[PDB]
Amino acid sequence: ASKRALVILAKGAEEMETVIPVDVMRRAGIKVTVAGLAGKDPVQCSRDVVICPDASLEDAKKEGPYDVVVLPGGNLGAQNLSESAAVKEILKEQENRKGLIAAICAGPTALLAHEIGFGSKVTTHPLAKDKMMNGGHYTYSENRVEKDGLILTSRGPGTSFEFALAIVEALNGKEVAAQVKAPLVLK
Amino acid sequence: ASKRALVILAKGAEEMETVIPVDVMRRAGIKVTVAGLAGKDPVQCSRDVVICPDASLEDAKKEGPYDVVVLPGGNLGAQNLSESAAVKEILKEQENRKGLIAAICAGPTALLAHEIGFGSKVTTHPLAKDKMMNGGHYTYSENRVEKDGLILTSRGPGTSFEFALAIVEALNGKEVAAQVKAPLVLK
């Protein structure tokens, strides 16, 4: 009965957008796999924090499926996610099984790259809006967290707690999210 | 020319309270050294995120001093900081030279262990108040961020952005902190 999350960690990922969801989800009793896009080696993030993944994405894929697939932002990280055929297949399969997909900041641009969730209302970091909206395949929102069915998106480092808690609430319900939230000392 | 920050990373540290200040400070142009209390090896944080430090604390001591010394929380992390003579040394030197010391969540309890800043007004996580106030060596505050001279404290993961921006403002001024703040999409 524990819910499961896959967080895909690429070189250049935004480390706050990676660690806040991982930590908050684990606080909720979600079993989170931090999966390295490139393999099991440590990953240099956007502001040079170095994070060691739990597993390679190839190994993590065999242990799925997952209740949520999470895409951090960072412009290089999102570019790396967007160029990956391995990411494409995991996102398609996740949409095809009606599992949640959650992406933050520049992360939603990988949904565009991989043709995931076309027609959804989405948000992104303001500086990623133009890229996301190229071809008109989505509807744009200014909400800090936007959820359209199983496509959950959010805007930036400063929306990461909100984004993480939305994932927790989607998976484990409102009371678990509230119980995780209170010790955080959010405003 | 750039200001310099030391972030001390012990086993069991709160990974959000580590990464948010590192990332925000680097966005502000501060040179941040993530120093592993126990050497250069990867550090397993409170919710099992594994972070590779930039340097050992032993080397970082030699490479100092710093414009700010930062103590993340996490109860095991704070306990390890509290039991380290090296941390003591660094904090006493920083206090002596009138440099900023910044501690969040359970982190300020290491100030207590090392007899730093006695008589200051401080905040902590609510659950760390008891420990911090044992013996009456500080005055307690319920402000999200508290600053009494060069002792800067804060309360939890959800105050980490405010804590980090307060460090930026102290080192680089109000306009740099505002400029760093805007792209984060804080509320």
Q: Is A31 on the interface with B (CB under 8 A)?
A: no
CATH classification number, A1-187, choose in 3.40.190.10, 3.60.15.10, 3.40.50.880, 3.40.720.10: 3.40.50.880
DSSP lists the bridge partners of residue B50 as A52, B44
> Is residue B45 annotated as a catalytic residue, yes or no?
no
Among the partner residues B34, B49, B155, nearest to A185 by beta-carbon distance = B155
Which whole-number Å values give the CA distances from B29 to B2, B71, B144, in the listed order? 7, 20, 25
Structure tokens at A66: 């997952």
- B42–A52 C-beta distance less than 8 A: yes
DSSP letters along A51-117, please?
EE-SEEHHHHHHT---SEEEE---HHHHHHHHH-HHHHHHHHHHHHTT-EEEEETTTHHHHHHTT-S
Classify residue B175 by burial, with Cβ atoms within 10 Å: 0-12, 13-18, 19+: exposed
State the angle between helix axes of B15-27 and B160-172 in degrees (0 to 180), rounded to the nearest 10.
30
Q: How many CB atoms lie within 10 A of CB A18?
A: 31
DSSP letters along B114-183, please?
TT-STT-EE---GGGHHHHHTTS-SEE---SEEEETTEEEE-SGGGHHHHHHHHHHHHH-HHHHHHHHGG
Structure tokens at B167: 């460090």
In whole angstroms, give the CA distance from residue B119 to residue B61.
Answer: 26
Side-chain half-sphere exposure of A62, counting CA atoms within 13 A: 4
Q: How many CB atoms lie within 10 A of CB A50?
A: 17
**Cis, peptide link before residue B65, omega less than 30° from 0:** yes
DSSP lists the bridge partners of residue A32 as A5
The amino acid at B108: P
Among the partner residues B20, B47, B185, nearest to A26 by beta-carbon distance = B47
Radius of gyration of chain A (CA): 15
The contacts of residue B67 (CB under 8 Å, 6+ apart) are: B3, B4, B5, B30, B99, B100, B171
In whole angstroms, give the CA distance from residue A140 to residue A121.
Answer: 6
The amino acid at B185: V
DSSP lists the bridge partners of residue A7 as A34, A70
In B, minimum Cα distance to A7 occurs at B49
What residues 130-149 of chain B have any CB closer than 8 A to a CB of chain A? 144
In whole angstroms, give the CA distance from residue B186 to residue B61.
Answer: 34
Among the partner residues A16, A42, A52, nearest to B20 by beta-carbon distance = A16
DSSP lists the bridge partners of residue A151 as A101, A148
Report resolution in angstroms.
1.2
Element (H or E) spanning A129, and its range?
Answer: helix A129-132
Structure tokens at B152: 């800067």
In whole angstroms, give the CA distance from residue A17 to residue A38.
Answer: 19
